[PDB]
């Protein structure tokens, strides 16, 4: 029923300014009390940025005050975040959140990457070994996040481990492994499926013995 939804550019260049919009449905942004912006740093800590009250007055985090602006549109039932001299350090998941006597509602979050990097497709490498057998896939040097890694188009899932992407240096890298019975490989086909929406990349890599 009640829903808060963030939208905006998911990629911003350093020195530029990020602008996010929260679209509220279920009730008016004119209902008490606070209409907040929160952020969650990469694999990390949550920081409250500021809020706009049901009466249009703002309160900010003293560290952010000077770079931050929270406005609203009561007609459109939306509130906004503007964060100015952005830095690589402002890369986080941004959430819009409401608070009152009912408790609180939040958005699903929008990831905002702050980088000077250009859209790079991933290089997908098949990892074969030199009763159970482990195979791998190296998804190296892509930008921005995310990619989607599957094995045998989704028909494998069971013994799969997909590892979070590590950032080095302006580019992301991740690996995935699959552990299947020795009777199954190389007798049957094990394929690594990698998709990178940002660069319209869709690679299929067969794991072949050396």
């Amino acid at each position: 029923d009640v829903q808060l939804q963030e939208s905006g550019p998911g990629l911003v260049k350093p020195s530029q300014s990020l602008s996010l919009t929260c679209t509220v449905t279920g009730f008016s942004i004119t209902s008490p009390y606070a209409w907040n912006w929160i952020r969650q740093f990469p694999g990390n800590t949550l920081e409250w940025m500021g809020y706009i009250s049901y009466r249009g007055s703002t309160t900010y985090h003293p560290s952010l005050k000077s770079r931050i602006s929270i406005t609203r549109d009561t007609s459109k039932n939306q509130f906004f975040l503007q964060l100015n001299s952005v830095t690589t350090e402002d890369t986080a998941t941004y959430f819009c959140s409401s608070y009152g006597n009912y408790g609180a509602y939040s958005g699903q979050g929008t990831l905002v990457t702050v980088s000077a990097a250009k859209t790079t497709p991933p290089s997908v490498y098949p990892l074969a070994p030199g009763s159970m057998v482990t195979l791998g896939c190296l998804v190296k040097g892509y930008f921005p996040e995310p990619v989607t890694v599957t094995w045998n188009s989704g028909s494998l899932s069971s013994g799969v481990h997909t590892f979070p992407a590590v950032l080095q240096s302006d580019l992301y890298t991740l690996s995935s492994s699959v552990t299947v019975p020795s009777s199954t490989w190389p007798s049957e086909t094990v394929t690594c499926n990698v998709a990178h929406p940002a660069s319209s990349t869709k690679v299929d890599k067969k794991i072949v013995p050396r």
């Binding site: 409250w48 985090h61 030199g130 190296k140 481990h161 590892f163 590590v166 492994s177």
Partner: protein, 216 residues
């Protein structure tokens, strides 16, 4: 700024057991109106933080009765009478009493299980990568418990730390284990001027590591 200190940061529990997380305030969190804006959020993996308890002890809509919250002054407690599998994630306390509104570091509620050694797998660089002048040696230390393990790489009898990048998964929903991947990134020339590549799973040693290697 009010600092919120969470005890513990890792909480291993068995399904059906009691669990208690403590949040200690560096100063009073009583707002100018008399209310204490102390909240507890739960963040499930892949999801956003969601409110459990607000105003110290008031449960939010749809929150089970196994979750209760208490406290006064500077010490607040979240109790889970009987831990269910849907309850796993990171628990945050939050204060909305004084500006700036602050959060604790989060408490990873985790599923306790018997110790399991990792499955160590070493992979030489792929010939497709060498074509571009790079050579990544990949190692997987899969399905282990608890996180008390590390990677050590050796090239021709010497530990190597430069060019190593590690990645950890969250607690596995299959068997409550952990996994990590380690990548040794060399140039094609670096790779071609060495022969022995070793990957090791180490544990406060004393202990004998689980070793995997190849000759080039």
């Amino acid at each position: 700024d009010v600092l919120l200190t969470q005890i513990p940061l890792s909480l291993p529990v068995s399904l059906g057991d009691q669990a208690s997380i403590s949040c200690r305030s560096s100063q009073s969190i009583v707002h100018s109106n008399g209310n204490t804006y102390l909240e507890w959020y739960l963040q499930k993996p892949g999801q956003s933080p969601k409110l459990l308890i607000y105003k110290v002890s008031t449960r939010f809509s749809g929150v089970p009765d196994r979750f209760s919250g208490s406290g006064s002054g500077t010490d607040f407690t979240l109790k889970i009478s009987r831990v269910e599998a849907e309850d796993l994630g990171v628990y945050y306390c939050f204060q909305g009493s004084h500006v700036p509104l602050t959060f604790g570091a989060g408490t990873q509620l985790e599923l306790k299980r018997a110790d399991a050694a990792p499955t160590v797998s070493i992979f030489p660089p792929s010939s497709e990568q060498l074509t571009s002048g790079g050579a990544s040696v990949v190692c997987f230390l899969n399905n282990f418990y608890p996180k008390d393990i590390n990677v050590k790489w050796k090239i021709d009898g010497s530990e190597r730390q430069n060019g190593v990048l590690n990645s950890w998964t969250d607690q596995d929903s299959k068997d409550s284990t952990y996994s990590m991947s380690s990548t040794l990134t060399l140039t094609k020339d670096e790779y071609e001027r060495h022969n022995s590549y070793t990957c090791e799973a180490t544990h406060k040693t004393s202990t004998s590591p689980i070793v995997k290697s190849f000759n080039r």
